[PDB]
Design a protein around this ligand. Structure first.
Ligand SMILES: C[C@H]1C=CN(CC2C=Nc3ccccc32)CC1
Lengths: 178, 244
């Protein structure tokens, strides 16, 4: 059961904490969705290999440039998050987060994760974005960014409906093992 | 942590912690505010539990069972005693505020109406200056501690057998020497996430809304001061490297 460290990065409203909670609980929290995520050591067996994956979050650290990097030491896989209902969060990926991750975590694989894929086919979400000359992030836009930034992968998921959440973390375990 | 407080905070939310006949008596907005307040005390109890692991299990265990200098043990767990006294006192006032809010003839049904005054006291004056000074020191010695742990574990057999032994029980899964150090470092940044969500559901009493509004500015000013005084320490870093 080799130990690997995963860190999730991204803008405040990208839904990274929600993703980490839904995976660890393995259930959409019926009564209360927590505000914070402390840590968790997931028992994962991907492709016949048993790995303990420590799950970490940078939520709350986004404005503190000398506090945030203290989460990066010994990272094995970085999950770069962005919201599908927020096209400006994807624009921030190559010019804010990517230079920083590649500096503190050299040679650590990065997986581009587009959260909230459910909102891509949501009425109120497409309506709000149209009132700012915009639309939700398209699949090819996320894939193009993942290629442009030199990511290992591009994946999509919906933390609310649970679609694709298990596979993000099984692929992350695989990337960490390379 | 003690068994009384673990059972009081065993539930996933305040709506599960209280008796269902007592929950029914309240508005939707009150339950929402109380769920977020319960999360603050529950995560503070876990934070204090983490610091008691670092001092009682890791720090003292190494002092009483291993043969390394006390300067080596100090390099591993900087400011743990100073932090443990700061957070145990904060927890003490949070748990007392909850106890005074309990109904007569009950040990689970409570409603915390005033929290802002408690957070204004903690995040201002000498208690805020002692957290600013302790976190600036801890987070600067953070990377130095991890390298000392990695060096020790990879070079001492007795340290390896101590660590493998004390971190063997299932309940210590998330609490290693390195996870404890990061758990402490990340805690300060959790307060403005919790205080803003309590503030989101505390618009009913205007006095509470303004107290939480002030408490949130106090936390952000403290976080800005801790962040501005951080400079990573390196073991055997020359004087020329530091002024470059
Ligand atoms: C999936 C469910 C999760 C949360 N529910 C609402 C709720 C219950 N307690 C609180 C506290 C603060 C904010 C929202 C809530 C509704 C849906």
């Amino acid at each position: 059961a080799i130990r690997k460290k995963l860190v999730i990065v991204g803008d405040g409203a990208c839904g990274k904490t929600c993703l980490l909670i839904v995976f660890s609980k393995d259930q959409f929290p019926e009564v209360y969705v927590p505000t914070v995520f402390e840590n968790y050591v997931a028992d994962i067996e991907v492709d016949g290999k048993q790995v303990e994956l420590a799950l970490w979050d940078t939520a709350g650290q986004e404005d503190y440039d000398r506090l945030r990097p203290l989460s990066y030491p010994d990272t094995d896989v970085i999950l770069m998050c962005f919201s599908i209902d927020s096209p400006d969060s994807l624009e921030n990926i190559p010019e804010k987060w990517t230079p920083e991750v590649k500096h503190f975590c050299p040679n650590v694989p990065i997986i581009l994760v587009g959260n909230k894929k459910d909102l891509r086919n949501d009425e109120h979400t497409r309506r709000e974005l149209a009132k700012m000359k915009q639309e939700p992030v398209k699949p090819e836009e996320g894939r193009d960014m993942a290629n442009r930034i030199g990511a290992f992968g591009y994946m999509e998921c919906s933390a609310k409906t649970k679609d694709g959440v298990r596979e993000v973390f099984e692929m992350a375990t695989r990337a960490a093992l390379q | 942590s003690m068994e009384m407080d673990e059972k009081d905070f065993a539930a996933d939310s305040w709506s599960l912690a209280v008796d269902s006949s007592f929950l029914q008596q309240h508005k939707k907005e009150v339950m929402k505010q109380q769920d977020v307040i319960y999360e603050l005390i529950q995560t503070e109890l876990h934070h204090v539990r983490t610091l008691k692991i670092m001092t009682r299990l890791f720090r003292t265990g190494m002092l009483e069972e291993l043969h390394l200098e006390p300067g080596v043990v100090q390099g591993l767990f900087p400011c743990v005693d100073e932090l443990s006294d700061i957070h145990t006192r904060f927890l003490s006032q949070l748990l007392e505020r909850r106890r005074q809010a309990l109904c007569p003839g009950s040990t689970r049904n409570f409603v915390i109406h005033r929290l802002g005054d408690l957070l204004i006291s903690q995040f201002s004056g000498p208690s805020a200056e002692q957290m600013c000074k302790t976190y600036s020191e801890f987070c600067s010695r953070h990377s130095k501690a991890l390298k000392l742990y990695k060096e020790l574990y990879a070079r001492d057999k007795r340290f390896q057998q101590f660590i493998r032994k004390v971190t063997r029980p299932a309940v210590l899964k998330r609490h290693g020497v390195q996870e404890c150090i990061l758990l402490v470092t990340q805690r300060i940044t959790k307060y403005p996430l919790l205080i803003s969500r309590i503030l989101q559901h505390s618009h009913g009493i205007e006095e509470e809304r303004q107290d939480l509004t002030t408490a949130l500015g106090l936390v952000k000013e403290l976080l800005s001061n801790v962040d501005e005084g951080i400079y990573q320490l390196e073991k055997g870093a020359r004087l020329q490297e530091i002024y470059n």
